[PDB]
């Protein structure tokens with residue numbers, strides 16, 4: 131756990147900003163958070179950010195693949211990476227006696243890669259298989275289809291790239307993404323730790339001794355205003371008869387930007403609908419027998435997407451759609467809005483409480499917060515903002531985002 | 547762990563650590579073997595749980611996270627929540643322990659969910675290995691009772707176990723729930739039942755669960771619904787044995803992995819075309835253990851996989867020091883899931899997987915201890931269980 135804290139941030143003379151937040155315990159999560167992701171791509175390089183992420187982790191001169199494998203096996207340096215639409219990270223969760231090796235590996239891999247045609251060409255099959263695998267989880271497929279028909283802009287791209295895009299990715303494209311997106315001024319080193327701030331700082335200093343300062347600062351290729359998103363509600367239906375007597379469906383609305391005063395209202399409304407679990411279903415849902423329900427709301431630059439999705443038997447599909455639309459409408463009723471606000475606020479608080487017990491979760495929020503917000507948002511200010519959120523804020527959110535708005539919708543049917 | 551005994555005899559075990567999420571629950575020695583068939587226990591306890599929580603809406607509105615684990619010989623219920631939901635959570639645990647049968651309508655709803663388990667993502671590869679092991683490696687045939695009914699078979703409420711639960715319950719909780727659990731425990735009848743339950747002896751049976759799999763499982767079009775599963779079991783040791791950490795190390799030496807680096811991975815996953823995955827587990831029961839190696843592959847290829855598993859066994863005897871240390875390293879995984887492990891380890895009477903004491907145990911396992919474990923386990927003929935049509939005796943021949 132973590133004690134309503136605040137990060138401490140120092141900048142090395144080479145430009146690398148080191149952000150730490152104090153945590154009790156013996157686990158440390160640390161690594162690099164970079165504003166690199168599919169939002170910053172176009173049609174010509176779709177999939178490159180994720181493709182780079184893999185190449186990075188295929189090792190460099192100092193730490194080739196065999197040396198990496200050896201470090202996980204014998205030395206307990208278990209490296210993790212992921213790429214989203216908006217950010218990328220390379221991290222390790224470690225015992226504290228492993229600090230210098232971990233800061234050294236991560237710095238070398240992220241900031242000193244050696245990107246070769248052979249490693250790039252050799253990686254292609256791994257990414258093709260990953261794309262195949264994700265394509266067999268219909269929650270992932272319908273999530274991507276919903277993004278695709280809602281955004282003609284780059285948010286509509288799958289993170290991995292289409293099959294065709296994965297095949298066309300060149301070494302030059304991978305090197306270009308690293309050269310334009312992985313500089314000191316587009317990233318933070320993050321550590322969630324008991325170790326003092328200065329210990330992390332010196333260790334990163336030592337790990338990044340090869341790194342020369344930037345001569346200049348061209349406008350970051352990751353700036354949101356270079357990738358203005360346009361949400362346009364559309365409907366598309368697909369077949370997948372391998373599903374049998376089953377269909378997937380997803381409903382989408384535009385959501386507020388992260389810095390919108392209406393962001394927290396959208397999170398509360400999304401949460402009060404929430405997900406269906408084995409024992410748990412929103413009081414807004416009338417037919418509690420619906421097979422399943424998942425709700426998400428993400429910000430994407432000037433835009434964002436609120437999504438509701440599930441699967442049902444063919445005969446229950448249309449009823450699922452009505453239940454969800456009815457539940458969303460029910461929040462706006464003056465008899466229900468107060469209670470919806472209260473329950474939704476509690477949902478957001480419970481989600482927060484659950485995040486505070488893991489150094490991995492804390493690291494990811496801190497890294498994302500630093501990259502994506504104008505100014506750092508503490509859990510402190512966040513809770514006050516949640517507590518000060520009122521019925522008029524919810525109404526204004528409904529007025530701007532929900533009421534009288536066309537929704538996107540995708541259906542993938544076993545029969546249709 | 548802070549361990550107490552209430553004035554009425556009820557045991558109370560508390561997990562130390564920082565505040566944030568409150569945890570409560572109950573663990574008791576009633577499992578799928580205490581009903582006359584597969585799923586009877588599971589659906590009885592599930593029916594009871596949903597009634598105890600009043601409605602799914604109450605659960606959501608209080609943001610309570612319930613979790614029910616039914617095993618062959620024992621089960622537990624945990625509830626996680628923020629401090630403002632304490633009253634509802636405790637009152638729900640109290641109702642669960644009140645002995646009353648659920649309504650037939652609740653039971654009917656729960657039965658339908660149970661039949662749908664595989665389609666719903668609730669009957670995954672892990673649960674299949676457990677059923678295959680339990681239906682094949684015990685002399686007592688009651689261990690064949692799992693949690694997930696076959697499509698053509700009946701499921702019946704077992705009201706007697708609901709009466710039995712409060713008579714053999716241990717209460718569990720995070721340390722901040724001490725006062726509320728003392729009080730809840732106090733409300734239960736003195737004094738607990740004491741039953742000698744003993745894990746059934748090993749027997750190397752050869753069985754099939756030749757049953758079709760649904761194409762959609764959860765949200766995935768399963769990459770395994772057309773493949774067979776081979777589970778090979780040998781007896782090992784109780785969770786309390788001095789030998790258990792050697793067994794954990796022995797399971798990492800075999801290890802495994804998916805097509806989507808250790809003996810099972812390199813030799814079995816690498817050696818059979820279209821072998822989706824292979825893994826070794828060491829699974830614990832009240833007084834014993836089953837060391838099990840599970841292979842997912844096409845039906846025609848299982849015999850070959852078994853030959854490659856035999857090779858893995860032979861290979862362990864000459865394992866290098868590098869690898870014996872790496873195996874020791876792999877067991878050390880520190881990382882909600884913490885409380886569930888606390889409860890599990892409290893029943894087994896072993897040190898939790900996250901504890902430093904456990905980590906120290908693992909650091910202290912020798913080559914001798916691993917060799918001893920290997921010798922006594924692989925001296926038995928394996929139990930053999932196939933999810934699919936493959937003839938288990940043909941697989942069994944590979945080891946005789």
Ligand SMILES: [Zn+2]
Nearest residue numbers: 180184257260
């Ligand atoms: Zn990937």
